[PDB]
């Protein structure tokens, strides 16, 4: 449920060495990779557990008590001085000191290493799912000498994949990024792409957050006589942080502050009995029970009702407000809405018609009128899903929505502009994407925490464009905005 993800560096010998190359030991590149995912799960803050281990080496860290290994850490959600604790390992001083202080390279034996790290899959005491491992190697030859080691590769390998446990080798630059194809299968283990490097890892997880989540499950009675139960889902919440946590000063420790009510006149206490929930205006104070309030919500019950069918195009935006998060109607428990819900969306979409509902949130609420667009089902060859089949949970518009908005005259433009304006926008347009879109200015703080995480000087201080780039603005389009400026006006801004 909260799963496994694993760092590993191969060792024969020369790997922790740089191949005498003048940039880095690709070993070290791997080092910052480890840094990058383990750090990454600071941001993503993933109850997935992470692994740091090496092998193939001089001394050992393990419980399996064999040559050419080191544990680094056991499976973990991260730690600040788990980060720091591993932070020694950059730098040639830290290359070496890391190496020798631990000892660096002698021999190894492959599938031995398999059940090594696998036997870090032993380390699981908890609920995990994903078994995912990464070897760091340029190794062209595991060995030529004992091909019984090779049979051991092709032997235990299939076991460990069959173990559901999956390690691959990303294209880490042995020359050509690798030149080897040949025997390599064993070494390695909703439409997307793949990459050979860490940078993708780096930025991709710079802002990243939770993955496996579906929890509170409501229903929809369609009519009074027929059934569906409805899965509540958050495509997101407009995801925010785990928020500021109380820890006292020098003690550093959680306050375990509590709250109740003393009497605020006499030194006595107060109790929910002793108080109530009031509205007050003018002269009259008026007091009614926290109960009385919470059940004044009551109309029906948490649950949902097909309230009808509407033109989809009937409302585009005259309007908009707090989103649908996405309810997928459950079909395992209640199926046939497999079929029902299926052809529902089929034809209602065909009708450009939608199923209105009155949604009743959890432990009641006052419920509300909200449309449900049938959500279509979009999948390509490898099945990118932009539209998981379902409903758009479409809030209806209401008085408050319209509580105010002005109306007055409008003076209008001319085609003389649009002739240029269009292509002007063609310079201002970009094909956009699903991706690289956020409010990082909050991200920057879990950068600021990446600090104490590594305990270093300045953050990653990475780059997303949520802000426009001038060279392109003044580049592709140019100053034709001048033409527009003096079209109808000498502005002085």
């Amino acid at each position: 449920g909260r799963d496994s993800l694993i760092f590993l560096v191969d060792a024969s010998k020369a790997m922790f060495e740089s191949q005498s190359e003048d940039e880095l030991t690709p070993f070290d590149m791997s080092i910052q990779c480890i840094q990058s995912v383990y750090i990454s799960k600071i941001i993503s803050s993933d109850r997935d557990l992470l692994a740091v281990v090496f092998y193939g080496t001089e001394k050992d860290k393990n419980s399996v008590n064999f040559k050419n290994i080191y544990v680094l850490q056991e499976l973990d959600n991260p730690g600040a001085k788990r980060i720091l604790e591993l932070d020694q390992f950059k730098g040639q001083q830290g290359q070496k000191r890391f190496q020798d202080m631990m000892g660096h390279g002698s021999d190894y034996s492959l599938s031995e290493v398999l059940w090594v790290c696998a036997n870090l899959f032993s380390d699981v005491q908890f609920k995990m799912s994903h078994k995912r491992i990464m070897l760091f190697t340029n190794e062209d030859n595991p060995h030529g000498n004992d091909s019984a080691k090779a049979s051991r590769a092709r032997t235990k390998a299939g076991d460990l994949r069959d173990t559901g446990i999956f390690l691959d080798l990303m294209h880490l630059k042995k020359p050509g990024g690798f030149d080897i194809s040949l025997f390599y299968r064993d070494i390695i283990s909703v439409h997307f792409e793949e990459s050979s490097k860490l940078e993708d890892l780096l930025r991709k997880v710079r802002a990243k957050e939770t993955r496996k989540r579906a929890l509170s499950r409501l229903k929809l009675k369609l009519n009074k006589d027929i059934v569906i139960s409805v899965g509540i889902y958050n495509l997101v919440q407009k995801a925010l942080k785990p928020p500021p946590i109380k820890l006292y000063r020098e003690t550093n420790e959680p306050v375990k502050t509590k709250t109740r009510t003393f009497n605020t006149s006499t030194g006595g206490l107060l109790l929910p009995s002793d108080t109530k929930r009031s509205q007050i205006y003018g002269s009259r104070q008026i007091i009614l029970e926290k109960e009385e309030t919470e059940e004044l919500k009551r109309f029906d019950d948490p649950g949902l009702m097909l309230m009808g069918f509407k033109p989809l195009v009937l409302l585009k935006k005259h309007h908009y407000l707090r989103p649908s998060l996405f309810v997928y109607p459950e079909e395992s428990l209640v199926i046939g809405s497999s079929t029902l819900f299926s052809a529902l969306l089929i034809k209602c979409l065909e009708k450009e018609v939608a199923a209105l509902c009155r949604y009743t949130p959890r432990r009641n609420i006052p419920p509300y009128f909200v449309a449900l667009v049938p959500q279509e089902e979009e999948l390509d060859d490898q099945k990118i899903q932009v539209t998981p089949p379902g409903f758009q949970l479409v809030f209806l518009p209401f008085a408050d929505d319209k509580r105010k908005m002005p109306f007055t005259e409008k003076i209008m433009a001319t085609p003389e502009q649009v002739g240029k304006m269009k292509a002007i926008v063609e310079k201002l347009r970009f094909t956009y994407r699903s991706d690289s879109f956020e409010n990082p200015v909050l991200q920057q703080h879990f950068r600021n925490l990446e600090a104490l995480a590594l305990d270093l000087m300045e953050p990653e201080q990475a780059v997303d464009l949520t802000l426009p780039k001038v060279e392109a603005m003044n580049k592709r389009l140019g100053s034709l905005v001048d033409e527009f400026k003096e079209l109808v006006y000498p502005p002085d801004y």
Partner: protein, 365 residues
């Protein structure tokens, strides 16, 4: 089959059919075949998927009874079609394992009870499984460990030192312990020092509970001790460091308490093995293993031993008014009866010293 066959998700109607089907099949190589393939093959299938069907166990023993015996079956006759059908039941299994944790495998396993004699399909899973199930806490060690370990059986022995090292002391906990007991069948296996390192718990945790543990434990401490047998051999010094350290244990096992049979087979072993066929020296080096004792009543033991020995049966064969007929009884009949009467009498008591005349007579004479 027909009757039964066709049960489905949440179908408790299987329950009868299954229970039977096992019990039926439980008879003796279902003749003219069960027709489980012959009237139709996929009677197989139904039985199989049926095994899968749900959390509800019932399939287990059923399948088990089926499947374990199913191979035990197919030996005496055409073996084939039974076979791969398993492999299905595997994929069934391998799923169940991978699909979700506990009930799935553990079922598969108590099932697999009758299953084994083809392996890794479960094993190299159960490899992590079981220990992770130390992760999964309680009776897995039983149900699991049990299952796996009789899974291990012949010709795994190697990494046991590792798989098994992941646990045993990880429980004091008890009634499972049959396992910790059972586990050691290795006569020529783990012989180098690793084994002794493994012997470290041997009587550590065997002490207090129902000795039912002790029974087989020591019982193989025999097998292994023969396997250590050091008669002026020196397979190694350390070898004999065991072999003795064994003996420490072993004669600590010459101490019976509640079960006599402890000391029974303990002894008769001591006889043909720990002893020669002899009186006199046996009396001598008898003492040899008495030193480490630091422990009492033993005297009775050594004695009574040599009371059995001193006459195996050269005793009664060589035994030396109705009142006028007791005259010859108190005139001439036999003195032999005394011999056991002595020992038995004399076995129980406290300071009895007649032992000591036996001693010195057993030497000074």
């Amino acid at each position: 089959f027909e009757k039964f066959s066709g049960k489905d998700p949440n179908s408790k109607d299987n329950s009868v059919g299954i229970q039977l089907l096992g019990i039926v099949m439980a008879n003796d190589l279902p003749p003219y075949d069960p027709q489980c393939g012959i009237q139709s093959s996929e009677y197989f299938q139904a039985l199989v998927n049926n095994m899968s069907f749900v959390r509800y166990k019932e399939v287990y023993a059923a399948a088990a009874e089926v499947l374990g015996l199913i191979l035990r079956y197919v030996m005496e006759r055409k073996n084939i079609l039974e076979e791969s059908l398993c492999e299905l039941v595997a994929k069934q299994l391998k799923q169940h394992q991978n699909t979700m944790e506990d009930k799935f495998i553990v079922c598969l396993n108590k099932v697999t009870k009758s299953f084994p004699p083809l392996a890794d399909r479960f094993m190299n899973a159960v490899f992590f499984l079981l220990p992770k199930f130390h992760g999964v806490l309680k009776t897995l060690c039983l149900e699991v460990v049990l299952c796996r370990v009789e899974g291990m059986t012949e010709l795994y022995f190697q990494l046991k030192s590792k798989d098994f090292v992941q646990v045993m002391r990880h429980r004091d906990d008890e009634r499972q312990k049959v396992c910790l007991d059972i586990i050691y069948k290795m006569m020529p296996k783990l012989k180098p020092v690793e084994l002794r390192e493994l012997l470290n718990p041997v009587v550590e945790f065997v002490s207090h509970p129902s000795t039912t543990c002790r029974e087989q434990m020591y019982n193989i401490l025999m097998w292994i001790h023969d396997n250590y047998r050091d008669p002026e051999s020196e397979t190694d010094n350390d070898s004999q460091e065991i072999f003795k350290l064994a003996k420490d244990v072993l004669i600590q096992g010459l101490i019976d308490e509640n079960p006599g049979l402890q000391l029974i087979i303990r002894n008769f072993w001591s006889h043909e093995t720990r002893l020669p066929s002899n009186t006199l020296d046996r009396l001598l080096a008898l003492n040899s293993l008495y030193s480490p004792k630091i422990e009492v009543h033993f005297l009775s033991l050594a004695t009574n031993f040599l009371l059995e020995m001193t006459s195996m049966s050269p005793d009664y064969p060589n035994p030396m008014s109705y009142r006028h007929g007791d005259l010859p009884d108190i005139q001439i009949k036999h003195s032999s009866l005394i011999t056991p009467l002595q020992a038995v009498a004399q076995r129980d008591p406290i300071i009895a010293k007649q032992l000591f005349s036996s001693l010195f007579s057993g030497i000074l004479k």
